[PDB]
Design a protein around this nucleic acid. Structure first.
Ligand code: MG
Ligand code: MG
Ligand code: MG
Ligand code: MG
Ligand code: MG
Ligand code: MG
Ligand code: MG
Ligand code: MG
Ligand code: MG
Ligand code: MG
Ligand code: MG
Ligand code: MG
Ligand code: MG
Ligand code: MG
Ligand code: MG
Lengths: 212, 91, 153, 85, 126, 25, 99
RNA sequence: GGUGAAAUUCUUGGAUUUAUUGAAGACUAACUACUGCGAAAGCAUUUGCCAAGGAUGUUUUCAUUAAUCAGGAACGAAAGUUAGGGGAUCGAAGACGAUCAGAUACCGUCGUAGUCUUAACCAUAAACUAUGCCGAUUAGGGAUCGGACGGUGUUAUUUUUUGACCCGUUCGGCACCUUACGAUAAAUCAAAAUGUUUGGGCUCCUGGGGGAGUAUGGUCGCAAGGCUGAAACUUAAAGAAAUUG
């Protein structure tokens, strides 16, 4: 029975998540030459944004958390990546409408690379009679230029945590729709995925500032 | 490019290095075109002469082969002096 | 003679003695007489410059790489051969390179190298066609041609 | 008067060495002996001095390049990468 | 209320019920359909998937696992994208054996590239 | 017989015919 | 005899269309010629929906729906009874079956 | 793993499964359509550069400069060839395990050439709309793509312009639906109509079925082969579309 020799820890969410206790975990205990501190350092937890924010409108998003420090029986995890769920993404495509995908890579002020995948779909007019809602390729390229410009400019003037605070209400998608009303109106403008490429020198004051 | 085709049609230009310096010394030159692959010592000499004469310099993004073609000539040209702009707006 | 890749004699200034130090590098495809060659940690990343491997981004192409700091040139010195920088590891100062044979290797990040590809590439793509051309090829290298077959002895 | 039909420069080898080897060699014999345009003065006076060395008769400027061509595809691809990078 | 994740492999040849921690690094119990039948053809049977699900559900009690997030995947990627019959049996058994069910998601690997699948051009002439 | 492989059989037979002629030539 | 006006596909004016793989045969068939079904069904069967709602904790959870696009060749669709042989006059009716 | 069921195969050296990361090469899913571009073959991630193209609008210019084309030339899927690079997946040949009377097959595990790329060949496809190119006329109808025009009302911006949606007109396309004043042997066709009431212009091909796209000669190709292309002899049918069993 190789489970009496395994201890249980906890998961601590960073700011600005409403719920800080994400959940529990399991690992081998310290037994000499096998430290628990470096065995958990680097683990990735994929949890729903809905649970963290205690909302039912975020059920289709997931937040990845990365263990960076261990404080007794609690692992202070930091943000590792935002992404959708498979169920929501397949429901969003549909037919007879144009799908627009834009991608960019932004470097935050705290030496973080983030690749942001932005997704959008055309809007069916209230009085529309024709079946299809396609956009011309010139409009699509014009839309993509507006999307990339907004994503790059919006995330460049903020830190990593500030960007997460921006992602929670999906505020960035609001101005993308606003800027593209005069080109072609859109729906379900979101950030499909957020992926980090590298990290800066590991810090504790910034890490603890989120948990305190 | 196309502007250079108009000035050779109407205005007065000077092709070559030895005659471009002669134009610069007289002070009547007002524009200098320098090819991309001119010898760097010659390039620096032409720029220094223009600074003495307060003459504008354009660095043509092309070799002697392309610069000579732009003038309509069938020989390579490394530098130019535009004495009269003619009916062109290169100035 | 006997090499297959051209050499370039580069002249530097002695920083102590008021003298010109002649030195023969291995020329890269693109070098020319009258070119200025910069060697050092702070040298710009252009063809023909000699830089430490730690100050050169991954994916580049270098030649005359040295295994050990001070061993003035060991790897990638034939006609069309070159060394590719695969990745870095600045925690202890070590650089992972890829050799012409296809083997990966880890060397010091302070090891030097010349940006570019050695000159004379494609040399072995032309048939010699003649016993003379093989004879003259080896006559300036060493006495190893021709080889009698051992099974005929 | 358009001497020969197929061999071209490889007609100096007679009926020797095999047809395929004479085709493989003329691919580089034509490039080896051709005159190229100097990139420093524009004159068509660049010829191979020795293997990997190409000299311009007018500039008196020596260039290091490929064995049978002034530049190799690898060098050009390598050189364009640095400029864009 | 301790949460776990139950990664369920449902192919047409066999079924996997696999519970791990929130990260997947530590696995608790892992039993398959082929561990509960005597014939190879029954490895993917709905009955076998149910029997495997119960023993996983039984085993999770000792560690105190009370709630399970469920991830369902098929032999996706360079293959089919439809879960086998074992997926349904596992879901029903866990929901009845005394487990709280959290988030349910499909995690079948979807290729945007789809390298050359086996069989073509004429596929499986059956 | 399929015309695709009647063509293949004849084409194979033609190749053998040319070898027999080269042998005599 | 020409059996169908559109031959067997929809590529009039398209020249060439990249092929796809059959869902249960792996047959290499053109995308427009293939027989495509978009299926939207609950990820849990209707019989077992109630038990999933019982285990809901967290009792307002809505079971997600699987979103499949099945592509078949002619042989598989006919053998799988997705499509059936129709009469000479009934072949021309391009209307989906009513509900 | 895999199958109708199995077995070859991997596995306590931890197979399969779980998570993270890296490398390699290929490809570009869902969006994707009786939609678009291209002479055809073909063409689906983003960005920049380079050159090109049709339609539209025109109270711009030239003024017959045009149509089709024997020989002649450019491009030409896949497979295949030569020389390098690459080689993930799949997979001719080959080796096994099944099934079977046999199984040199369908099925399963491996697996070489190939599949990818640069330089050079090859020039054939059910290369099909089995329907040559130009031009005129002839029944209705609604969708859809690109452009233009007129009108109307919402929506975003706006020193009231532009985009999306709505209605209509017209030019040019991909097609489609009903009908026969017509056509065909019929299936069917807005062209396969305007043809015994038989003549708008041009090019190519066919003359019962085989032998046969074979033999030979020529020419092109590294080769595989391509283009051109018979005759002896044999035979009363072969064949097309529909009809009832
Ligand atoms: Mg002897
Ligand atoms: Mg075709
Ligand atoms: Mg394992
Ligand atoms: Mg389109
Ligand atoms: Mg795509
Ligand atoms: Mg245009
Ligand atoms: Mg033909
Ligand atoms: Mg035909
Ligand atoms: Mg007409
Ligand atoms: Mg229209
Ligand atoms: Mg319109
Ligand atoms: Mg069209
Ligand atoms: Mg006759
Ligand atoms: Mg006949
Ligand atoms: Mg019949």
């Amino acid at each position: 029975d190789p489970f009496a020799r395994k201890d249980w820890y906890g998961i601590k969410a960073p700011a600005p998540f409403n719920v800080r206790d994400v959940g529990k975990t399991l690992v081998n205990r310290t037994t000499g030459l096998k430290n628990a501190n470096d065995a958990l350092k680097g683990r990735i937890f994929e949890v729903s944004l809905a649970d963290l924010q205690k909302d039912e409108d975020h059920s289709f998003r997931k937040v990845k958390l990365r263990v960076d420090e261990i404080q007794g029986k609690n692992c202070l995890t930091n943000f590792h990546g935002l992404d959708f769920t498979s169920d929501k993404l397949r429901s969003l495509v549909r037919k007879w409408q144009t799908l627009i995908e834009a991608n960019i890579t932004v470097k935050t002020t705290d030496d973080y690379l983030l690749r942001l995948f932005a997704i959008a779909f055309t809007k069916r007019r209230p009085n529309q009679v024709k079946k299809t809602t396609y956009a011309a390729s010139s409009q699509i390229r014009a839309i993509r230029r507006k999307m990339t410009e907004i994503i790059q400019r919006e995330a460049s003037s903020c830190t990593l945590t500030q960007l997460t605070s921006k992602l929670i209400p999906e505020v960035i998608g609001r101005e993308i729709e606003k800027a593209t009303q005069g080109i072609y109106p859109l729906q379900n403008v979101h950030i499909r995925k957020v992926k980090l490429l590298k990290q800066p020198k590991f810090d504790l004051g910034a890490l603890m500032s989120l948990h305190g | 490019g196309a502007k250079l085709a108009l000035v050779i049609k109407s205005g007065k230009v000077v092709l070559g290095y030895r005659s471009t310096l002669k134009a610069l010394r007289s002070g009547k030159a007002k524009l200098i075109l320098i090819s991309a692959n001119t010898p760097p010592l010659r390039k620096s000499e032409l720029e220094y002469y223009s600074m003495m004469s307060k003459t504008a310099v354009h660095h043509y993004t092309g070799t002697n082969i392309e610069l000579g073609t732009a003038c309509g000539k069938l020989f390579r040209c490394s530098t130019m002096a535009i004495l009269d702009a003619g009916d062109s707006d290169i100035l | 003679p006997g090499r297959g890749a051209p050499l370039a004699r580069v002249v530097f200034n002695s920083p102590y003695k008021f003298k010109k130090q002649r030195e023969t590098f291995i020329a890269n495809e693109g070098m020319y007489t009258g070119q200025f060659i910069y060697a050092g940690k702070n040298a710009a990343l252009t063809v023909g410059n000699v830089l430490p491997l730690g100050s050169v981004p991954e994916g580049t192409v270098v030649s005359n790489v040295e295994e050990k700091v001070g061993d003035r040139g060991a790897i990638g010195r034939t006609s069309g051969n070159y060394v590719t920088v695969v990745g870095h590891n600045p925690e202890e100062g070590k650089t992972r390179i890829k050799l012409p044979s296809g083997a990966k290797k880890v060397v010091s990040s302070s090891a030097r190298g010349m940006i570019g590809i050695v000159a004379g590439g494609g040399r072995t793509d032309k048939p010699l066609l003649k016993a003379s051309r093989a004879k003259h090829k080896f006559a300036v290298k060493r006495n190893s041609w021709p080889k009698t077959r051992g099974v005929a002895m | 008067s358009k001497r020969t039909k197929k061999v071209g420069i490889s007609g100096k080898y007679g009926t020797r060495y095999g047809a395929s080897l004479r085709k493989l060699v003329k691919k580089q014999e034509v490039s080896q002996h051709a005159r190229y345009t100097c990139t420093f003065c524009g004159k068509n006076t660049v010829r191979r001095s020795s293997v990997g060395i190409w000299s311009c008769k007018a500039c008196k400027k020596t260039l290091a390049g490929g064995a049978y061509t002034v530049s190799t595809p690898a060098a050009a691809a390598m050189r364009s990468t640095l400029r864009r990078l | 209320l301790v949460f776990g994740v139950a990664r369920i492999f449902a192919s047409f040849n066999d079924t996997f019920v696999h519970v791990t921690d929130l990260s997947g690094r530590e696995t608790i119990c892992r039993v398959t359909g082929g561990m509960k039948v005597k014939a190879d053809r029954d490895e993917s049977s709905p009955y076998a998937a149910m029997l495997a699900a119960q023993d996983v559900a039984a085993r999770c009690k000792e560690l105190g696992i009370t709630a399970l997030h469920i991830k369902i995947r098929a032999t996706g990627g360079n293959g089919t994208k439809t879960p086998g019959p074992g997926a349904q049996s596992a879901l029903r058994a866990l929901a009845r054996s005394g487990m709280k069910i959290g988030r349910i998601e499909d995690v079948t690997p979807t290729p945007s590239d789809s390298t050359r699948r086996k069989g073509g051009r004429r596929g499986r002439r059956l | 017989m399929r015309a695709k492989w009647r063509k293949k059989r004849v084409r194979r037979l033609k190749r053998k015919r040319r070898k027999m002629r080269a042998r005599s030539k | 005899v020409k059996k169908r006006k559109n031959n067997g596909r929809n590529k009039k004016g398209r020249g060439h269309v990249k092929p796809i793989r059959c869902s249960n045969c792996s047959r290499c068939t053109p995308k427009d010629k293939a027989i495509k079904r978009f299926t939207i069904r609950n990820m849990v069967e209707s019989a077992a929906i109630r038990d999933i709602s019982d285990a809901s904790v967290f009792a307002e959870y809505t079971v997600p729906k699987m979103y499949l696009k099945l592509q078949y060749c002619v042989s598989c669709a006919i053998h799988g009874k997705i499509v059936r042989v129709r009469s000479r006059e009934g072949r021309r009716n391009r209307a989906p079956p009513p509900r």
